[PDB]
Design an enzyme around this catalytic site. Structure first.
Site, mmCIF file in Angstrom:
data_model
loop_
_atom_site.group_PDB
_atom_site.id
_atom_site.type_symbol
_atom_site.label_atom_id
_atom_site.label_comp_id
_atom_site.label_asym_id
_atom_site.label_seq_id
_atom_site.Cartn_x
_atom_site.Cartn_y
_atom_site.Cartn_z
ATOM 1 C CG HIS A 39 -0.289 0.011 2.852
ATOM 2 N ND1 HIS A 39 0.253 1.113 2.946
ATOM 3 C CD2 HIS A 39 -0.226 -0.701 3.646
ATOM 4 C CE1 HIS A 39 0.692 0.770 4.455
ATOM 5 N NE2 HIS A 39 0.364 -0.259 4.534
ATOM 6 N N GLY A 141 3.847 5.741 11.547
ATOM 7 C CA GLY A 141 4.925 5.675 10.798
ATOM 8 C C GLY A 141 5.665 4.315 10.780
ATOM 9 C CB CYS A 143 3.417 0.527 7.687
ATOM 10 S SG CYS A 143 1.632 1.294 8.400
#
Lengths: 299, 300
Positions: A39, A141, A143
């Site tokens: 993503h 922040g 991921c």
């Protein structure tokens, strides 16, 4: 008896920063491939119904900016493995350790290196919850943060953070992009399942208490499997299996306490309660210690 | 919904841990620049430990009596000196992986990460706080002596602790990197009694302020107390007294929120007299006291 995390040095040198457009997240740099959540190619408004297959057609190599501290790497090609983006770079990581990609089961433990913008900031020990989530502190922040275990010289990578559920809990994939639990990498309302207590881990923790010398909960009674499950299901405890008894076998042997005898102690703690007492200085029953963890930290 | 207690990444400390062997005794050492620091009771046997004359024992040792191994690389000891309760072994080779480092002496209530090591090999890392009785309840087995505690600020490792002794209470005692013990403890096999362990009041208050910032507010009440009245109730529950310095440290938190410190103090007393009533605060069923105000003010 405290929750010890694995040393993180071998994994610290593999963390990088991946930027595509305005999105910046964490990547895993192994040999000549950077692994990160897919993503990263999405905008905040694409996340409603992202068609990742079309989205990857329209990106190119120069759209990805891989940041290894201060040295930049050239994405020389890109690919996709179910939910994980694999960026092929021009430089092999000289810090690549002996590693494997494994898929763990619910109830197993591992360490998590919480990173922010490709910089490691903390490490903690956690367990796969039975509802396929984990209790973490990934504010924002983080991921692409990874979970791991260390076996002698081999680092087994078992988890990559993808999403933060609104309950406080977090969801992620294995390193092959196969994603733990009934979740998708979309911005939509996703609800986590019904969180049950890992019964086998509690019993291992109770054995650890006996090893240290806390033995007030030991009784003279013994129960059966079938009787114990009714009591455990009522109190939202995972049904104990015969394999669970075998896994606890080695701990049952030195303590002298049979698994079904210890199960009778657990039943009393479930129904009557601690009765104003503490086990290992805790009024709460811990379930994030696997039997292997207890053996590692005690014997 | 939740503070989980994170430890600092241990990579920079892992490359400094070595194994020190003197006679039949083997423990861990810290290799920085050209010095290996380790506890001085490495020169002791089990007999010497009840009444050790450390200067008698050291005067009789030579450089070749100390075996230092960084993995499989043998380090060649060229000198030795005793600073308080630590042995400083000078080796011929500087550690190529020395990070930027500092030595600091911490006060009770301050937190750090511990890298638990066993005969030269890191085993695990955990976060802890210096208890008000100058002890730490960590996970230390036999052979973890010389394991260190540290904090990382940018790229500077602040070494603050070195494990020396396990107390019969189950807790552990140690020194700073200058060799000064924390608390009234000695490197001797005697009846050393730790003091009464008390809850770190300022840390609980900082944690409660984090709760109202996230959204937990069910414990708030409409009363305020004086500092003298709060401390009178606090000692009844084995809580550390609160000083004026603690109030000023919580000041930014009370500015970020609307609740004054003495207002927060009245809520804490109500929690102490009623209990948790089955509810949770930041996903925790107990009042937690190993979060310093500095950490909360940062990771808001």
């Amino acid at each position: 008896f405290r929750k010890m995390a694995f040393p993180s040095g071998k994994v610290e040198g593999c963390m990088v920063q991946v930027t595509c457009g305005t999105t910046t997240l964490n990547g895993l740099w192994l040999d000549d491939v950077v692994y990160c959540p897919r993503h990263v190619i999405c905008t905040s408004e694409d996340m409603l119904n992202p068609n990742y297959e079309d989205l990857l057609i329209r990106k190119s190599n120069h759209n990805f900016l891989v940041q290894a501290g201060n040295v930049q790497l050239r994405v020389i090609g890109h690919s996709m493995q179910n939910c994980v983006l694999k960026l092929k770079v021009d430089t092999a990581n000289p810090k690549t350790p002996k590693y494997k990609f494994v898929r763990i089961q619910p109830g197993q433990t591992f360490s998590v290196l919480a990173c922010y913008n490709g910089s490691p900031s903390g490490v903690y020990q956690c367990a796969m919850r039975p509802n396929f989530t984990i209790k973490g502190s990934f504010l924002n922040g983080s991921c692409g943060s990874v979970g791991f275990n260390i076996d002698y010289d081999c680092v087994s990578f078992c988890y990559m953070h993808h999403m933060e559920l609104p309950t406080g809990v977090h969801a992620g994939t294995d390193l092959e992009g196969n994603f733990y639990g009934p979740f998708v990498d979309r911005q939509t309302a996703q609800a986590a399942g019904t969180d049950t207590t890992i019964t086998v881990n509690v019993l291992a923790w109770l054995y650890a208490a006996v090893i240290n010398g806390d033995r007030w909960f030991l009784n003279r009674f013994t129960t059966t499997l079938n009787d114990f499950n009714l009591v455990a299901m009522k109190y939202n405890y995972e049904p104990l299996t015969q394999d669970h008894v075998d896994i606890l076998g080695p701990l049952s042997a030195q303590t002298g306490i049979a698994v079904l005898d210890m199960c009778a102690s657990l039943k009393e703690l479930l129904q009557n309660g601690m009765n104003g007492r503490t086990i290992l200085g805790s009024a709460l029953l811990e379930d994030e210690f696997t039997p292997f963890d207890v053996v590692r930290q005690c014997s």
